[PDB]
PDB file of C-alpha atoms in Angstrom:
ATOM      1  CA  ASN A   2      15.318  68.758 319.016  1.00  0.00           C
ATOM      2  CA  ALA A   3      13.312  67.734 315.617  1.00  0.00           C
ATOM      3  CA  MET A   4      16.826  66.705 313.265  1.00  0.00           C
ATOM      4  CA  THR A   5      16.495  62.916 312.890  1.00  0.00           C
ATOM      5  CA  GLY A   6      20.116  63.578 311.802  1.00  0.00           C
ATOM      6  CA  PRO A   7      23.811  64.277 312.955  1.00  0.00           C
ATOM      7  CA  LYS A   8      24.729  67.507 313.913  1.00  0.00           C
ATOM      8  CA  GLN A   9      25.720  69.299 310.499  1.00  0.00           C
ATOM      9  CA  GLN A  10      27.344  72.519 309.616  1.00  0.00           C
ATOM     10  CA  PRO A  11      25.357  74.556 307.067  1.00  0.00           C
ATOM     11  CA  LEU A  12      26.751  75.817 303.736  1.00  0.00           C
ATOM     12  CA  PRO A  13      29.581  78.774 304.429  1.00  0.00           C
ATOM     13  CA  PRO A  14      27.641  81.766 303.520  1.00  0.00           C
ATOM     14  CA  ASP A  15      30.305  82.636 300.832  1.00  0.00           C
ATOM     15  CA  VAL A  16      29.913  79.618 299.164  1.00  0.00           C
ATOM     16  CA  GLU A  17      25.772  79.273 298.533  1.00  0.00           C
ATOM     17  CA  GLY A  18      24.633  79.148 295.187  1.00  0.00           C
ATOM     18  CA  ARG A  19      28.210  79.452 293.554  1.00  0.00           C
ATOM     19  CA  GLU A  20      28.668  76.505 290.784  1.00  0.00           C
ATOM     20  CA  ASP A  21      31.827  76.618 291.117  1.00  0.00           C
ATOM     21  CA  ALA A  22      32.569  75.898 294.928  1.00  0.00           C
ATOM     22  CA  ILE A  23      33.155  72.474 295.322  1.00  0.00           C
ATOM     23  CA  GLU A  24      33.984  70.709 298.792  1.00  0.00           C
ATOM     24  CA  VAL A  25      37.062  69.245 299.639  1.00  0.00           C
ATOM     25  CA  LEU A  26      35.583  67.334 302.691  1.00  0.00           C
ATOM     26  CA  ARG A  27      33.600  67.020 305.581  1.00  0.00           C
ATOM     27  CA  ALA A  28      33.964  65.424 308.673  1.00  0.00           C
ATOM     28  CA  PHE A  29      32.121  63.746 311.836  1.00  0.00           C
ATOM     29  CA  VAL A  30      33.256  62.526 315.484  1.00  0.00           C
ATOM     30  CA  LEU A  31      30.715  59.419 315.975  1.00  0.00           C
ATOM     31  CA  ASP A  32      32.262  56.792 318.506  1.00  0.00           C
ATOM     32  CA  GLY A  33      35.486  57.993 319.965  1.00  0.00           C
ATOM     33  CA  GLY A  34      36.278  58.332 316.131  1.00  0.00           C
ATOM     34  CA  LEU A  35      35.976  60.307 313.015  1.00  0.00           C
ATOM     35  CA  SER A  36      34.172  59.997 309.856  1.00  0.00           C
ATOM     36  CA  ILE A  37      35.371  61.455 306.508  1.00  0.00           C
ATOM     37  CA  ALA A  38      33.847  62.243 303.141  1.00  0.00           C
ATOM     38  CA  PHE A  39      37.099  63.279 300.779  1.00  0.00           C
ATOM     39  CA  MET A  40      36.220  64.813 296.854  1.00  0.00           C
ATOM     40  CA  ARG A  41      38.153  62.674 294.260  1.00  0.00           C
ATOM     41  CA  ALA A  42      40.257  65.678 293.055  1.00  0.00           C
ATOM     42  CA  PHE A  43      43.246  66.691 294.432  1.00  0.00           C
ATOM     43  CA  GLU A  44      44.361  70.010 292.551  1.00  0.00           C
ATOM     44  CA  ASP A  45      47.318  70.912 294.356  1.00  0.00           C
ATOM     45  CA  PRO A  46      49.156  70.616 296.793  1.00  0.00           C
ATOM     46  CA  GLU A  47      49.266  74.247 298.686  1.00  0.00           C
ATOM     47  CA  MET A  48      45.548  73.966 298.767  1.00  0.00           C
ATOM     48  CA  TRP A  49      45.929  70.558 301.248  1.00  0.00           C
ATOM     49  CA  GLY A  50      49.064  72.819 303.547  1.00  0.00           C
ATOM     50  CA  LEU A  51      46.878  75.671 303.914  1.00  0.00           C
ATOM     51  CA  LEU A  52      43.648  73.151 305.005  1.00  0.00           C
ATOM     52  CA  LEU A  53      46.076  71.715 307.354  1.00  0.00           C
ATOM     53  CA  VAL A  54      46.863  75.200 308.517  1.00  0.00           C
ATOM     54  CA  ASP A  55      43.653  76.991 308.685  1.00  0.00           C
ATOM     55  CA  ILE A  56      42.398  73.957 310.498  1.00  0.00           C
ATOM     56  CA  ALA A  57      45.776  73.990 313.121  1.00  0.00           C
ATOM     57  CA  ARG A  58      45.349  77.477 313.976  1.00  0.00           C
ATOM     58  CA  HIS A  59      41.950  77.590 314.642  1.00  0.00           C
ATOM     59  CA  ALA A  60      42.270  74.507 316.837  1.00  0.00           C
ATOM     60  CA  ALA A  61      44.862  76.249 318.426  1.00  0.00           C
ATOM     61  CA  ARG A  62      42.478  79.480 318.879  1.00  0.00           C
ATOM     62  CA  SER A  63      39.703  77.614 320.175  1.00  0.00           C
ATOM     63  CA  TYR A  64      41.862  75.324 322.367  1.00  0.00           C
ATOM     64  CA  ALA A  65      43.709  78.774 323.593  1.00  0.00           C
ATOM     65  CA  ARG A  66      40.018  80.182 324.626  1.00  0.00           C
ATOM     66  CA  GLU A  67      38.586  76.565 326.245  1.00  0.00           C
ATOM     67  CA  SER A  68      42.531  76.552 328.821  1.00  0.00           C
ATOM     68  CA  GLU A  69      45.440  77.618 330.216  1.00  0.00           C
ATOM     69  CA  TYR A  70      47.401  78.101 327.333  1.00  0.00           C
ATOM     70  CA  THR A  71      48.612  80.868 325.186  1.00  0.00           C
ATOM     71  CA  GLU A  72      47.646  80.373 321.498  1.00  0.00           C
ATOM     72  CA  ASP A  73      51.419  79.702 320.695  1.00  0.00           C
ATOM     73  CA  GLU A  74      51.061  77.008 323.442  1.00  0.00           C
ATOM     74  CA  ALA A  75      48.289  75.619 322.193  1.00  0.00           C
ATOM     75  CA  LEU A  76      49.023  75.435 318.535  1.00  0.00           C
ATOM     76  CA  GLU A  77      52.763  73.359 320.544  1.00  0.00           C
ATOM     77  CA  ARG A  78      50.278  71.099 322.269  1.00  0.00           C
ATOM     78  CA  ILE A  79      48.170  70.156 319.004  1.00  0.00           C
ATOM     79  CA  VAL A  80      51.502  69.923 316.668  1.00  0.00           C
ATOM     80  CA  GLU A  81      52.753  67.177 319.761  1.00  0.00           C
ATOM     81  CA  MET A  82      49.886  65.501 318.930  1.00  0.00           C
ATOM     82  CA  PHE A  83      49.888  65.670 315.445  1.00  0.00           C
ATOM     83  CA  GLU A  84      52.990  64.257 315.520  1.00  0.00           C
ATOM     84  CA  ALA A  85      52.338  61.391 318.023  1.00  0.00           C
ATOM     85  CA  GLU A  86      49.841  60.195 315.456  1.00  0.00           C
ATOM     86  CA  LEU A  87      51.703  60.299 312.313  1.00  0.00           C
ATOM     87  CA  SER A  88      54.043  57.970 314.020  1.00  0.00           C
ATOM     88  CA  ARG A  89      51.299  55.281 314.230  1.00  0.00           C
ATOM     89  CA  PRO A  90      52.112  52.480 311.787  1.00  0.00           C
ATOM     90  CA  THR A  91      49.540  51.841 309.337  1.00  0.00           C
ATOM     91  CA  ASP A  92      49.466  47.904 308.924  1.00  0.00           C
ATOM     92  CA  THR A  93      45.993  47.165 309.605  1.00  0.00           C
ATOM     93  CA  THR A  96      40.289  49.390 301.944  1.00  0.00           C
ATOM     94  CA  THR A  97      37.036  48.638 299.991  1.00  0.00           C
ATOM     95  CA  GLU A  98      35.403  50.089 296.854  1.00  0.00           C
ATOM     96  CA  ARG A  99      31.872  50.222 295.422  1.00  0.00           C
ATOM     97  CA  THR A 100      30.924  50.676 292.126  1.00  0.00           C
ATOM     98  CA  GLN A 101      28.274  50.691 289.518  1.00  0.00           C
TER      99      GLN A 101
ATOM    100  CA  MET B   4      24.060  71.279 289.157  1.00  0.00           C
ATOM    101  CA  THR B   5      24.029  74.995 289.423  1.00  0.00           C
ATOM    102  CA  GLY B   6      25.028  75.010 292.833  1.00  0.00           C
ATOM    103  CA  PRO B   7      27.971  74.275 294.988  1.00  0.00           C
ATOM    104  CA  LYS B   8      29.535  70.537 294.670  1.00  0.00           C
ATOM    105  CA  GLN B   9      28.694  69.217 297.831  1.00  0.00           C
ATOM    106  CA  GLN B  10      29.433  65.900 299.905  1.00  0.00           C
ATOM    107  CA  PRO B  11      27.136  63.591 301.046  1.00  0.00           C
ATOM    108  CA  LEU B  12      27.541  61.980 304.490  1.00  0.00           C
ATOM    109  CA  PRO B  13      29.173  58.988 305.189  1.00  0.00           C
ATOM    110  CA  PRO B  14      26.505  56.335 305.586  1.00  0.00           C
ATOM    111  CA  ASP B  15      28.353  55.465 309.276  1.00  0.00           C
ATOM    112  CA  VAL B  16      26.393  58.980 310.023  1.00  0.00           C
ATOM    113  CA  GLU B  17      23.188  59.049 308.305  1.00  0.00           C
ATOM    114  CA  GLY B  18      19.951  59.014 311.211  1.00  0.00           C
ATOM    115  CA  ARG B  19      22.895  59.328 313.597  1.00  0.00           C
ATOM    116  CA  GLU B  20      21.944  62.149 316.199  1.00  0.00           C
ATOM    117  CA  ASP B  21      24.574  62.020 318.073  1.00  0.00           C
ATOM    118  CA  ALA B  22      27.500  62.714 315.447  1.00  0.00           C
ATOM    119  CA  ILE B  23      28.428  65.747 314.979  1.00  0.00           C
ATOM    120  CA  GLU B  24      29.983  67.593 311.901  1.00  0.00           C
ATOM    121  CA  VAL B  25      32.850  69.023 313.146  1.00  0.00           C
ATOM    122  CA  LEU B  26      33.761  71.053 309.735  1.00  0.00           C
ATOM    123  CA  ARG B  27      32.904  71.399 305.854  1.00  0.00           C
ATOM    124  CA  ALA B  28      35.932  72.549 303.528  1.00  0.00           C
ATOM    125  CA  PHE B  29      35.516  73.934 300.243  1.00  0.00           C
ATOM    126  CA  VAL B  30      37.074  74.953 297.833  1.00  0.00           C
ATOM    127  CA  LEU B  31      36.217  78.323 295.499  1.00  0.00           C
ATOM    128  CA  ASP B  32      38.672  81.184 294.160  1.00  0.00           C
ATOM    129  CA  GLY B  33      41.418  79.460 294.539  1.00  0.00           C
ATOM    130  CA  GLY B  34      40.694  80.082 298.810  1.00  0.00           C
ATOM    131  CA  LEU B  35      39.077  77.924 301.233  1.00  0.00           C
ATOM    132  CA  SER B  36      35.729  78.341 303.363  1.00  0.00           C
ATOM    133  CA  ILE B  37      35.679  76.325 305.900  1.00  0.00           C
ATOM    134  CA  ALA B  38      32.525  75.823 308.371  1.00  0.00           C
ATOM    135  CA  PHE B  39      33.747  74.833 312.033  1.00  0.00           C
ATOM    136  CA  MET B  40      31.340  73.553 314.942  1.00  0.00           C
ATOM    137  CA  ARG B  41      31.280  75.782 317.149  1.00  0.00           C
ATOM    138  CA  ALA B  42      32.077  73.520 320.576  1.00  0.00           C
ATOM    139  CA  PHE B  43      35.711  71.900 321.094  1.00  0.00           C
ATOM    140  CA  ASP B  45      39.004  67.350 322.591  1.00  0.00           C
ATOM    141  CA  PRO B  46      42.858  68.687 321.304  1.00  0.00           C
ATOM    142  CA  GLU B  47      43.073  64.676 319.779  1.00  0.00           C
ATOM    143  CA  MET B  48      40.837  64.744 317.769  1.00  0.00           C
ATOM    144  CA  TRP B  49      41.991  68.079 315.968  1.00  0.00           C
ATOM    145  CA  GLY B  50      45.085  66.328 315.907  1.00  0.00           C
ATOM    146  CA  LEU B  51      43.926  62.824 314.785  1.00  0.00           C
ATOM    147  CA  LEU B  52      41.812  64.749 311.897  1.00  0.00           C
ATOM    148  CA  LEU B  53      45.115  66.747 310.946  1.00  0.00           C
ATOM    149  CA  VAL B  54      46.986  63.487 310.398  1.00  0.00           C
ATOM    150  CA  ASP B  55      43.915  62.118 308.404  1.00  0.00           C
ATOM    151  CA  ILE B  56      43.909  64.703 306.167  1.00  0.00           C
ATOM    152  CA  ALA B  57      47.745  64.727 305.159  1.00  0.00           C
ATOM    153  CA  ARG B  58      48.283  60.869 305.119  1.00  0.00           C
ATOM    154  CA  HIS B  59      44.815  61.277 302.160  1.00  0.00           C
ATOM    155  CA  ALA B  60      46.906  64.577 300.683  1.00  0.00           C
ATOM    156  CA  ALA B  61      49.939  62.588 300.626  1.00  0.00           C
ATOM    157  CA  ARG B  62      48.645  59.557 298.409  1.00  0.00           C
ATOM    158  CA  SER B  63      46.625  61.986 296.342  1.00  0.00           C
ATOM    159  CA  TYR B  64      50.132  64.090 295.749  1.00  0.00           C
ATOM    160  CA  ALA B  65      51.716  60.451 294.703  1.00  0.00           C
ATOM    161  CA  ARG B  66      48.566  59.754 292.297  1.00  0.00           C
ATOM    162  CA  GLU B  67      49.854  63.009 290.620  1.00  0.00           C
ATOM    163  CA  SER B  68      53.572  63.577 290.492  1.00  0.00           C
ATOM    164  CA  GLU B  69      56.809  61.669 290.524  1.00  0.00           C
ATOM    165  CA  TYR B  70      56.263  61.173 294.385  1.00  0.00           C
ATOM    166  CA  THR B  71      55.605  58.170 296.201  1.00  0.00           C
ATOM    167  CA  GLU B  72      53.769  58.106 298.675  1.00  0.00           C
ATOM    168  CA  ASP B  73      55.990  58.434 301.950  1.00  0.00           C
ATOM    169  CA  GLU B  74      58.054  60.988 299.880  1.00  0.00           C
ATOM    170  CA  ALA B  75      54.413  62.914 299.532  1.00  0.00           C
ATOM    171  CA  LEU B  76      53.812  62.499 303.082  1.00  0.00           C
ATOM    172  CA  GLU B  77      57.329  63.696 304.108  1.00  0.00           C
ATOM    173  CA  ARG B  78      56.864  66.941 301.616  1.00  0.00           C
ATOM    174  CA  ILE B  79      53.400  67.799 303.175  1.00  0.00           C
ATOM    175  CA  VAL B  80      54.417  67.449 306.717  1.00  0.00           C
ATOM    176  CA  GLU B  81      57.177  69.496 306.170  1.00  0.00           C
ATOM    177  CA  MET B  82      55.210  72.224 304.497  1.00  0.00           C
ATOM    178  CA  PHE B  83      52.466  72.079 307.141  1.00  0.00           C
ATOM    179  CA  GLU B  84      54.991  72.761 309.794  1.00  0.00           C
ATOM    180  CA  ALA B  85      57.215  75.365 308.479  1.00  0.00           C
ATOM    181  CA  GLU B  86      54.071  77.340 307.883  1.00  0.00           C
ATOM    182  CA  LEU B  87      53.029  76.896 311.219  1.00  0.00           C
ATOM    183  CA  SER B  88      56.511  78.031 312.866  1.00  0.00           C
ATOM    184  CA  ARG B  89      57.157  80.892 310.376  1.00  0.00           C
TER     185      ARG B  89
END
């Protein structure tokens, strides 16, 4: 196609034109990994909890579509993979200011 | 300005036609509006969840009495409890 950039997601329709909508995060898969953009604000721990739950459940639904797993089994598998990765030591930052 | 406060592309994805946006999430009206890619590896979703949880823990520690380690335990507990509910 004629696009010169990445395969982006469009703004959700309920966000379009809304001055009060703030983008929390954008995540891209690139070179066998992830590149993520986060907003500066924290807001509250519950929002991050909601975001995690929404992503996990969405992933489980999609995984169950594309596999032999039920949605429950898919979610269990995703949580197992999450836990294995969470266990990795974080032993191994830059800033730009103007 | 008069529209949504967007995040720019990370510099490492600019011009990368092979890079794929997994999701964009907006906070609005006290909730979350998320655009997800249509295509589905499960491991990528696992990693994304870890990256978000880790980031949330660091941000939570900056705004609370908790250390990052304590914050991470709280966030993960919260997350897993809701999934099992």
